[PDB]
Short mmCIF file of C-alpha atoms in Angstrom, two decimals:
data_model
loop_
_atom_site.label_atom_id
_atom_site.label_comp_id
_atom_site.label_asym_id
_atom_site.label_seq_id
_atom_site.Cartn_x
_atom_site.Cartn_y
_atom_site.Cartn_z
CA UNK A 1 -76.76 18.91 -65.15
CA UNK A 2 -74.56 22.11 -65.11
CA UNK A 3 -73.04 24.74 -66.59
CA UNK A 4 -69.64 25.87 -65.57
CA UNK A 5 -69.59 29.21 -63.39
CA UNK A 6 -67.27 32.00 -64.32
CA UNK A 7 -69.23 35.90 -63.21
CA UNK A 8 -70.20 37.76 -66.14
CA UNK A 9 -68.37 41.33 -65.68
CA UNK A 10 -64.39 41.54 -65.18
CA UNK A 11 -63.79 45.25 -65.14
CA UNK A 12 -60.32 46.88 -65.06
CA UNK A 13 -58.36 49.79 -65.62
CA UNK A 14 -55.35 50.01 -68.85
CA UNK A 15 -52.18 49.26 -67.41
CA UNK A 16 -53.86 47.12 -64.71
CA UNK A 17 -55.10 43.79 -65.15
CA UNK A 18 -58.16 41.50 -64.55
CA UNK A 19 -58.46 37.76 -62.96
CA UNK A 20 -61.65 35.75 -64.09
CA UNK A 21 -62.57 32.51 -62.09
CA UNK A 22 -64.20 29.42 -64.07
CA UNK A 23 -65.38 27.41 -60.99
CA UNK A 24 -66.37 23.63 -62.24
CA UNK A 25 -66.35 20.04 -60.14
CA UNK A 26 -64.57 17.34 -59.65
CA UNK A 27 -65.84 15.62 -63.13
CA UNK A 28 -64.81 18.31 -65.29
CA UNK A 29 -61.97 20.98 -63.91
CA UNK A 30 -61.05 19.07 -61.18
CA UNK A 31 -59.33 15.48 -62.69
CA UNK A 32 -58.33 16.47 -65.86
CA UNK A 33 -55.89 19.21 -66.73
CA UNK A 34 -57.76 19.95 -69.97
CA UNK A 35 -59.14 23.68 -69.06
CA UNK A 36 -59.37 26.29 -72.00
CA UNK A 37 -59.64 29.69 -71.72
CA UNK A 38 -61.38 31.28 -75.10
CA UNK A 39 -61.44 34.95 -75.78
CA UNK A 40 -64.26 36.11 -78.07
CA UNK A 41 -65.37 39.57 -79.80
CA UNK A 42 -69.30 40.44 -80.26
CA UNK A 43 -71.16 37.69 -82.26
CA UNK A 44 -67.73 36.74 -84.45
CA UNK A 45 -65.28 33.71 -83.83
CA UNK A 46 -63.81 33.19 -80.62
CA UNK A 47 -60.39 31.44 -80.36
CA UNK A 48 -58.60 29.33 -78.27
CA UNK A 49 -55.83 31.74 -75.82
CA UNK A 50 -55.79 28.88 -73.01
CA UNK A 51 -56.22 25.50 -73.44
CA UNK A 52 -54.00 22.76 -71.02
CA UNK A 53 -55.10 24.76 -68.26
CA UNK A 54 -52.05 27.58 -68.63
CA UNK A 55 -49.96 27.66 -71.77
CA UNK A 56 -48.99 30.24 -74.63
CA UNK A 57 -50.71 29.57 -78.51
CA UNK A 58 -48.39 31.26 -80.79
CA UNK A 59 -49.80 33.98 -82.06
CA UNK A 60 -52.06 34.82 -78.57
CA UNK A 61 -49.79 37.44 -77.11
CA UNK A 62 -48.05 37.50 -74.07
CA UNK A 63 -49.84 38.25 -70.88
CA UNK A 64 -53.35 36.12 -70.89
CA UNK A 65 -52.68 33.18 -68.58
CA UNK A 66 -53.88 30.34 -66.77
CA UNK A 67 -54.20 28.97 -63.52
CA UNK A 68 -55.73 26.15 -61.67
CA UNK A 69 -56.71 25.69 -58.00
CA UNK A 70 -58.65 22.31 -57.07
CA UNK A 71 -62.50 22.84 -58.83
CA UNK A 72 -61.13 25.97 -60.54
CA UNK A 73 -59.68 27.46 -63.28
CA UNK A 74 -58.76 30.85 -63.38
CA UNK A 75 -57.57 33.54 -66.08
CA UNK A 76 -55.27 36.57 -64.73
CA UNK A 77 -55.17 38.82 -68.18
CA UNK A 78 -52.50 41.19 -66.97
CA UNK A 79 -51.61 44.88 -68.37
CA UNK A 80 -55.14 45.65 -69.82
CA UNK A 81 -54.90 47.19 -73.56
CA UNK A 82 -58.54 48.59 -74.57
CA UNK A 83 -59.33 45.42 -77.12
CA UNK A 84 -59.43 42.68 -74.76
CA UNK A 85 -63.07 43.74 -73.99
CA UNK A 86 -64.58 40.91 -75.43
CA UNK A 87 -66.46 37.68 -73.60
CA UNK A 88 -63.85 34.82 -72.49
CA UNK A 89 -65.40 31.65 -71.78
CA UNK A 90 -64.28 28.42 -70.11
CA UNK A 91 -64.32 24.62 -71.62
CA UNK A 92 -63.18 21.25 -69.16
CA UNK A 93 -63.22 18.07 -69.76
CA UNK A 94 -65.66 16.04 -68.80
CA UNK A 95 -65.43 12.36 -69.55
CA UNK A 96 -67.08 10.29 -72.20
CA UNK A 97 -65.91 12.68 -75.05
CA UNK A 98 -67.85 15.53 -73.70
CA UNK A 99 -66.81 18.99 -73.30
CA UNK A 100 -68.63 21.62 -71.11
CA UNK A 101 -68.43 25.39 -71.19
CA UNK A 102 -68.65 28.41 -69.22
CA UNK A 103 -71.65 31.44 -68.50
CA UNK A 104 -68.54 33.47 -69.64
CA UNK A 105 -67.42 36.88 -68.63
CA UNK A 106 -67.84 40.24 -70.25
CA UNK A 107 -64.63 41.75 -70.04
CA UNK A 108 -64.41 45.96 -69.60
CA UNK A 109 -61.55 48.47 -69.99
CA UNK A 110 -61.53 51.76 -67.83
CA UNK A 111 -59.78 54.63 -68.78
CA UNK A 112 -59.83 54.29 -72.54
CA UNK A 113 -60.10 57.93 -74.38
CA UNK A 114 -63.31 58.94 -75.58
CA UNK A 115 -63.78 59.99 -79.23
CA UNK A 116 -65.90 62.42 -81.27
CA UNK A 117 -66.47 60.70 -84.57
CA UNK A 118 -65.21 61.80 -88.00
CA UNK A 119 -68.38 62.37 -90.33
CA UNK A 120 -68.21 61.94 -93.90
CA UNK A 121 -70.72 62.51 -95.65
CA UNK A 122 -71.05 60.87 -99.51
CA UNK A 123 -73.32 62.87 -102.77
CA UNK A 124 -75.19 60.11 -104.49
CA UNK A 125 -72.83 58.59 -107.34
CA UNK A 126 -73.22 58.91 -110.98
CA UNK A 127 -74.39 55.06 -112.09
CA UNK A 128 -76.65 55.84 -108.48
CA UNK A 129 -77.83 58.89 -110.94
CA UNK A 130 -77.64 56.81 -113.71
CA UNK A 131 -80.19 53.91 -112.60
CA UNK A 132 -82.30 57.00 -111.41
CA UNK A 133 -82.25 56.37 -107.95
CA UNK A 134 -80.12 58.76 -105.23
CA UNK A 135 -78.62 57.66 -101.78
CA UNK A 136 -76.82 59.66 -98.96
CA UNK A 137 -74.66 57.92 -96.80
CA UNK A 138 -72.96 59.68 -93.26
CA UNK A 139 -70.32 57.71 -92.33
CA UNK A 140 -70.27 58.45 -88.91
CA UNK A 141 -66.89 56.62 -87.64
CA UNK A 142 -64.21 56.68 -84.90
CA UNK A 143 -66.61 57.64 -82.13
CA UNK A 144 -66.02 56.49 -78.42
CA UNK A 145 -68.66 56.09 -76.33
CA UNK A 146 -71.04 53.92 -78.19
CA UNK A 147 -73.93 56.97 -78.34
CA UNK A 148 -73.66 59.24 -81.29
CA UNK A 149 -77.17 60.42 -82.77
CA UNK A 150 -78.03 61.40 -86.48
CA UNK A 151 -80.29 63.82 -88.02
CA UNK A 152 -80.37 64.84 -91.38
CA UNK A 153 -81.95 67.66 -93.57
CA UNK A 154 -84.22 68.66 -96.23
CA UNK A 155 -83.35 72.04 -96.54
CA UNK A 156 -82.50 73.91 -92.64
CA UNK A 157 -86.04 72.52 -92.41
CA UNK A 158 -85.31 68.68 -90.91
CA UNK A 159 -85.56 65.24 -92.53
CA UNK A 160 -87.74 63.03 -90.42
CA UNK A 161 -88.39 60.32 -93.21
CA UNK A 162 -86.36 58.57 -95.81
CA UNK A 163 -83.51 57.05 -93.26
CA UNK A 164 -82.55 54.34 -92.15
CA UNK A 165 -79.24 54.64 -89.41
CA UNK A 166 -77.61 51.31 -88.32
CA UNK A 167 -76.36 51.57 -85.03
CA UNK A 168 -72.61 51.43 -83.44
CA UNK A 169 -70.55 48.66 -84.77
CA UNK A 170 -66.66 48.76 -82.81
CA UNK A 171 -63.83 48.50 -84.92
CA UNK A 172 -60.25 47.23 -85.30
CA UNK A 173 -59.30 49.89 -82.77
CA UNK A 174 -61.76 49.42 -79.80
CA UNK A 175 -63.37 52.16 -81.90
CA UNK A 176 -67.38 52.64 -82.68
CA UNK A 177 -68.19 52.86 -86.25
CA UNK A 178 -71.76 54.05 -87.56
CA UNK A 179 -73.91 54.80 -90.96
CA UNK A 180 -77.09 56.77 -91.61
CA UNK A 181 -78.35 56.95 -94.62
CA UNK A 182 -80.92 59.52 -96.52
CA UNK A 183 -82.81 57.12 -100.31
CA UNK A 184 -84.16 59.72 -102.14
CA UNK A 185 -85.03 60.45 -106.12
CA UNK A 186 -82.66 62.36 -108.19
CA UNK A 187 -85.51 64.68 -108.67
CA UNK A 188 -85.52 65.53 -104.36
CA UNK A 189 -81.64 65.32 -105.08
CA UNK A 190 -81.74 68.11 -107.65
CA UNK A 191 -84.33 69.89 -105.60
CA UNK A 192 -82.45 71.44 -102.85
CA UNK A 193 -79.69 73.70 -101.90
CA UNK A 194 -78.13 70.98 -99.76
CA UNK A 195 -79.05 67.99 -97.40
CA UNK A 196 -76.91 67.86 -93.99
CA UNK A 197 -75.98 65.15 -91.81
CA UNK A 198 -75.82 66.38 -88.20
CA UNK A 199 -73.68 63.62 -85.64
CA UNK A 200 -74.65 64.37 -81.92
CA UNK A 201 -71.76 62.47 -79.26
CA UNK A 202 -71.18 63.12 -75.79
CA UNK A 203 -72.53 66.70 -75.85
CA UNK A 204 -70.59 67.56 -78.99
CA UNK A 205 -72.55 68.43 -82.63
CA UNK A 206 -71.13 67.76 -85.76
CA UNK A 207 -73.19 68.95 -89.13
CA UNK A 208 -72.09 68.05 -92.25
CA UNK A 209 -73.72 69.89 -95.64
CA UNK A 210 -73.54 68.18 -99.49
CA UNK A 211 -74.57 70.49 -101.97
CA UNK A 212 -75.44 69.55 -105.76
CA UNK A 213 -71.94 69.83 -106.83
CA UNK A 214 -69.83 66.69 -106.97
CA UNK A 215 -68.06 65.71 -109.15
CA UNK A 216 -69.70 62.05 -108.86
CA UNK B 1 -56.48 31.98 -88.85
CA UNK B 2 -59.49 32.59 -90.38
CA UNK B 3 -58.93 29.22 -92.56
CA UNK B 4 -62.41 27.99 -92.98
CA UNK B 5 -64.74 29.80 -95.10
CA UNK B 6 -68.45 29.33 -93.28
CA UNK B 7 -71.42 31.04 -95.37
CA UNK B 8 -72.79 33.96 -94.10
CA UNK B 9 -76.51 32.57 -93.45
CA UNK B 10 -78.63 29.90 -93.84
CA UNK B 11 -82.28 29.64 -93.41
CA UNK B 12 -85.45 27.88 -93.55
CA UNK B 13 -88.99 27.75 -92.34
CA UNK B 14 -89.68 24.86 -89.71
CA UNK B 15 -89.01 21.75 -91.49
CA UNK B 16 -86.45 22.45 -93.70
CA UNK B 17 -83.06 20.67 -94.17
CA UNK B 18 -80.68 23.65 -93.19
CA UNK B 19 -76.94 22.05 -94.53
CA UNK B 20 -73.89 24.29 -93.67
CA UNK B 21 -70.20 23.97 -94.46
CA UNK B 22 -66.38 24.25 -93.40
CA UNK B 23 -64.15 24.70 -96.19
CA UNK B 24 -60.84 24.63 -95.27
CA UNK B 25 -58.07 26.60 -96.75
CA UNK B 26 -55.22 23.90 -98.50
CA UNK B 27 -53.78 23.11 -95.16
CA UNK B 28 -54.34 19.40 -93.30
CA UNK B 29 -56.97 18.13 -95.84
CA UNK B 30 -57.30 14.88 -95.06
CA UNK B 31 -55.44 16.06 -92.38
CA UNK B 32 -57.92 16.81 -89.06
CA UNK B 33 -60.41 14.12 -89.58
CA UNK B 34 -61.29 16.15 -86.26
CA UNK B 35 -63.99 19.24 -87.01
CA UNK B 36 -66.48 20.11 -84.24
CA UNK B 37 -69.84 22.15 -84.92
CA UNK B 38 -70.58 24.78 -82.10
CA UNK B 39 -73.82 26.46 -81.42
CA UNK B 40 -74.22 29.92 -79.59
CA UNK B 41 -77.22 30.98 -79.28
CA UNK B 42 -77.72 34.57 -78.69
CA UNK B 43 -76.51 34.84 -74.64
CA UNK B 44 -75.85 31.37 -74.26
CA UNK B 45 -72.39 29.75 -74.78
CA UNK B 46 -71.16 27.12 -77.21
CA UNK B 47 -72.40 23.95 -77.04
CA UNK B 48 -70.55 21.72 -79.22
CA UNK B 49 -73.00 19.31 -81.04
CA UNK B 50 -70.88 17.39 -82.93
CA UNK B 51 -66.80 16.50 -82.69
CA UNK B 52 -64.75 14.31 -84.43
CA UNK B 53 -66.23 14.86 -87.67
CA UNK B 54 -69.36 13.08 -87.59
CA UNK B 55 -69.61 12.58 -83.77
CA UNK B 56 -72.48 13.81 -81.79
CA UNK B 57 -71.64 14.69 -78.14
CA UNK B 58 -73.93 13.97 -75.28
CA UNK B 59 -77.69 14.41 -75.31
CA UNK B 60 -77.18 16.29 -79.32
CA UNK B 61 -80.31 15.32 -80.89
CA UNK B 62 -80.28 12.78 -83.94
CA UNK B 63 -81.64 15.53 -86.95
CA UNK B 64 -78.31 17.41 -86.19
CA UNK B 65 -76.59 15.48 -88.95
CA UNK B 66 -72.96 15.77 -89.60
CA UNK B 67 -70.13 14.42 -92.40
CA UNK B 68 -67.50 15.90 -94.20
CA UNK B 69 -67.58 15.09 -97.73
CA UNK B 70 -64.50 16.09 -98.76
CA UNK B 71 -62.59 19.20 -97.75
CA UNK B 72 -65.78 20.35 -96.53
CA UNK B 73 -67.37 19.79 -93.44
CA UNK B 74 -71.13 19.86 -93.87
CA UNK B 75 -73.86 19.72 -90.59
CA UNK B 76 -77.05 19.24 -91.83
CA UNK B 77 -80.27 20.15 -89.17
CA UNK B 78 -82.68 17.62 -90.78
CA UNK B 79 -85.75 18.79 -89.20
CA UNK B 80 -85.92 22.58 -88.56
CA UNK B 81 -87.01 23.59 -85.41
CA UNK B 82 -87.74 26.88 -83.75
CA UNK B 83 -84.96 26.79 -81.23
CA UNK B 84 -82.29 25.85 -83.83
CA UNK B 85 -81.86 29.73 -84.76
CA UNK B 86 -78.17 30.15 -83.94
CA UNK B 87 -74.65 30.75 -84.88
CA UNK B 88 -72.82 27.96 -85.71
CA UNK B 89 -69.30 27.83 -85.65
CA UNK B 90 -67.15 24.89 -86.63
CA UNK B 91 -63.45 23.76 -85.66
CA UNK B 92 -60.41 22.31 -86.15
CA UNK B 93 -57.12 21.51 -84.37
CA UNK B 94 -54.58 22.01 -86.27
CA UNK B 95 -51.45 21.14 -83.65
CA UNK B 96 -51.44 21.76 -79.95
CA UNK B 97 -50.82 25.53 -80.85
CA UNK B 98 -53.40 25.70 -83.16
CA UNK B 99 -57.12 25.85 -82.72
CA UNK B 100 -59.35 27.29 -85.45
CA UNK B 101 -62.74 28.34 -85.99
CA UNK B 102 -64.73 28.19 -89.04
CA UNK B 103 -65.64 32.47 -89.86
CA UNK B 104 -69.47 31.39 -88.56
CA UNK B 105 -72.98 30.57 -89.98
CA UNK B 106 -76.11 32.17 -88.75
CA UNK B 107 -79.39 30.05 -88.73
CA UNK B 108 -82.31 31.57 -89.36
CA UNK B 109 -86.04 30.69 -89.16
CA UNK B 110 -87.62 32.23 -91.73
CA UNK B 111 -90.05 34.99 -90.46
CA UNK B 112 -89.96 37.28 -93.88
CA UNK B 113 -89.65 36.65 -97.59
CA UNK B 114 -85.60 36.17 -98.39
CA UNK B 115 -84.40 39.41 -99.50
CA UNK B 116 -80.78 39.99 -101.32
CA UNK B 117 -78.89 42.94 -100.40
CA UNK B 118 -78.66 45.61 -102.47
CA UNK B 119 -75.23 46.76 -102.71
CA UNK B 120 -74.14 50.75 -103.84
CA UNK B 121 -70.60 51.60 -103.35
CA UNK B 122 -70.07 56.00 -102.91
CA UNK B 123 -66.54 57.05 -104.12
CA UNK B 124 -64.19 59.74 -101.93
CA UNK B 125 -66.13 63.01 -101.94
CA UNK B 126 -64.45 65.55 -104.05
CA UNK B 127 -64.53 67.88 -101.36
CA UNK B 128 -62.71 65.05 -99.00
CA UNK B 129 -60.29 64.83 -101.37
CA UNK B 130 -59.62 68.22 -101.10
CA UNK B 131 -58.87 67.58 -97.73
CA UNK B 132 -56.42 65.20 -98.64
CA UNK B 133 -58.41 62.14 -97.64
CA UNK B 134 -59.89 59.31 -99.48
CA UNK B 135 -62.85 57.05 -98.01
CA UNK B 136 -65.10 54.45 -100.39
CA UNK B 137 -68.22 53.19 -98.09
CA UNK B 138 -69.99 50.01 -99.35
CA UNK B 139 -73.34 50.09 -98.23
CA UNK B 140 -75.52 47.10 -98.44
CA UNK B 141 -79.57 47.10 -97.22
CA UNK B 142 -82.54 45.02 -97.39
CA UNK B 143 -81.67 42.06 -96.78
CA UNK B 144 -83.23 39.21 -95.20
CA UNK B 145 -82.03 37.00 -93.22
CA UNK B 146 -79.46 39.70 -91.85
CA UNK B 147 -75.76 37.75 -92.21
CA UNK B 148 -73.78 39.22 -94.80
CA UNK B 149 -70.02 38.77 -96.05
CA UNK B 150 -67.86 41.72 -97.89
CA UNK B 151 -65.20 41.41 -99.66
CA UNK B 152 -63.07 44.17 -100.92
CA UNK B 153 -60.84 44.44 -103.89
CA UNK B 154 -57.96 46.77 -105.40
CA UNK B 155 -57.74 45.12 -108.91
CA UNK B 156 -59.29 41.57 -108.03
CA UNK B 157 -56.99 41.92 -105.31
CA UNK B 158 -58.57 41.48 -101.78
CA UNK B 159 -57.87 44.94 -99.77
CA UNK B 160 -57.39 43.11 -96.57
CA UNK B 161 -56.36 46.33 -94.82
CA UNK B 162 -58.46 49.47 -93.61
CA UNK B 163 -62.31 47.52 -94.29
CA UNK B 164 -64.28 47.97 -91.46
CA UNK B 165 -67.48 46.35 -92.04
CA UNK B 166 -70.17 46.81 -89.62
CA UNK B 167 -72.83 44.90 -88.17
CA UNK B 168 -76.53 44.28 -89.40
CA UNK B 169 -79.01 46.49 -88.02
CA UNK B 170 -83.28 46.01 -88.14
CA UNK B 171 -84.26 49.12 -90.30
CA UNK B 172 -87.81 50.37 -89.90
CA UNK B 173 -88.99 48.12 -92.71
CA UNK B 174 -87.95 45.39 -90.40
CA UNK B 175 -85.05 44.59 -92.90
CA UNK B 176 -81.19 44.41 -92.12
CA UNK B 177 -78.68 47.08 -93.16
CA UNK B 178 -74.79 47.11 -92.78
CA UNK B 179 -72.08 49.09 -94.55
CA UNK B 180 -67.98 48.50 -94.67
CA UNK B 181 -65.91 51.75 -95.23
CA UNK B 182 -62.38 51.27 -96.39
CA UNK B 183 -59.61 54.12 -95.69
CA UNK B 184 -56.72 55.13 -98.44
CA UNK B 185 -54.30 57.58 -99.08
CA UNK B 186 -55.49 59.67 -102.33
CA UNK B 187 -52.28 58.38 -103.95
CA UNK B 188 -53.02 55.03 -103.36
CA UNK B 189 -56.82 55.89 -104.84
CA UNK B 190 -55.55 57.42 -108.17
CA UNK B 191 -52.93 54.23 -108.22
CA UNK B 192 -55.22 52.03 -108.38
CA UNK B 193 -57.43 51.26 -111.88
CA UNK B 194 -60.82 49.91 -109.90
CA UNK B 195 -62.05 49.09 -106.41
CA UNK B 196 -65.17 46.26 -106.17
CA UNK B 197 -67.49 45.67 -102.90
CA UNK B 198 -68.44 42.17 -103.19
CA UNK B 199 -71.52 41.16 -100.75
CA UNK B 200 -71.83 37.59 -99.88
CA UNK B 201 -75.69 35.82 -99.39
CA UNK B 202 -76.97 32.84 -99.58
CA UNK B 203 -75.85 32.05 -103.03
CA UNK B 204 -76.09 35.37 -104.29
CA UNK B 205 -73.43 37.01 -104.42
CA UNK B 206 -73.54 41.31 -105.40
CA UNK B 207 -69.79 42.83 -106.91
CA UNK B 208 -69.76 46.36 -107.57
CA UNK B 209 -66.73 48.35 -109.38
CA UNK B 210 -65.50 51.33 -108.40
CA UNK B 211 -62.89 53.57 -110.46
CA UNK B 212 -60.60 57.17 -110.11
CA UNK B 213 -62.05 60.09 -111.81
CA UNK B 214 -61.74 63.96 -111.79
CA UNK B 215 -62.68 67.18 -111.79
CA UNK B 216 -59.98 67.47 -109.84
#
């Protein structure tokens, strides 16, 4: 059997443009016309862009096309805006109602601005208070590259123990978006001074401080 | 569009009956007797194991049930095996121009105890305010298996603008975590009476209610 071979890594620049193949045989690309092109984002639906081997979906913009030449298929995605790193994979025909797909490319942007994330950090709420238990969460958000580090603190002295930090989702703007969080009892809450959430990307610090104060 | 509502996870041990659905939004009930199940598997591509309905491609083994009961597509893995942990996304063509995939189900073997989420929702800092901003973070941890919908609402009123949910991470207790922040406009905070987090898993189903209040 087979696959269908596109090469897993179609890097360009913004304002440039990138041209994945999707090589198949003469029993799937090559006979039949039926050639889709599907553009997908990390672990979430992908959707049809191309389908009869080059044609617009209304609603996919502009500039993703299609072409065929003999055993293959090709997408030329042309003007490169930051979100169309995703993964687009390939689907032919084959015969006997069977459809075959592609190893699928990971498509890369160049050039896009990197970010220092916005830190916010949020005081453990009053029902929080009120069910006796206390959480701290450091939304760590708009960050560009992908690494951004978190620390937090018990008091200057550091907190080691107590968090748990998911790490970098990417956002509706080709954006990285973050949480750490510090569970601790009211009484630890009511304990000290403050607790600080320090953010560490691309060589610059951020330190955020919540004092016992609130309003919540 | 994002026109048929997949559950967030399923899960079983080996041996278990995992059924998962496509509802479709109003739209061509009746309509595409034509829904396709897709696996992924983590790095793979998307096989699809069943098309027209209840019709299993090429080489799909026999347990990977399918029907469509009404409105709802349901595939059924009758026999739980190892290798069956994937996403599954289902399908319809709805016109030439229009291909859609179900939001996506994750299948999971079950290697802990099921675990809901527990869902805390922190209000704008007062201090944030003060900066003129206003940010509500939804957190949601310990859960098992780690697949999770949000939901946001302004007054039972999806807020389908400014969520950014993230994406489930292992904490050190080998449970998932993820968190959706939502950015307003202080005015549009106060103008509002409540804002709810709802968390979506495996039948349960967490809603928490947030409101404005003061200090200042």
């Amino acid at each position: 059997p087979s696959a269908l071979t596109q090469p897993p890594s179609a890097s360009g620049s913004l304002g440039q443009s990138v041209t994945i193949s999707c090589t198949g045989t003469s029993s799937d690309v090559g006979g039949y016309n039926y050639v889709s092109w599907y553009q997908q984002h990390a672990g979430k639906a992908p959707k049809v862009i191309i389908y009869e081997v080059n044609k617009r979906p209304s609603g996919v913009p502009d500039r993703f096309s299609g072409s065929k030449s003999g055993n293959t298929a090709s997408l030329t995605v042309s003007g490169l805006q930051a979100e169309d790193e995703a993964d687009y994979y390939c689907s032919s025909y084959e015969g006997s109602d069977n459809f075959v797909f592609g190893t699928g490319t990971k498509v890369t942007v160049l050039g896009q601005p990197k970010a220092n994330p916005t830190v916010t950090l949020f005081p453990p709420s009053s029902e929080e208070l009120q069910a006796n238990k206390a959480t701290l969460v450091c939304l760590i958000s708009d960050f560009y590259p992908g690494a951004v580090t978190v620390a937090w603190k018990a008091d200057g002295s550091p907190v080691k123990a107590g968090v748990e930090t998911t790490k970098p989702s990417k956002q509706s703007n080709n954006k990285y978006a973050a949480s750490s969080y510090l569970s601790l009892t009211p009484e630890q809450w009511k304990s000290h001074r403050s607790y600080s959430c320090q953010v560490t990307h691309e060589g610059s610090t951020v330190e955020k401080t919540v004092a016992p104060t609130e309003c919540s």
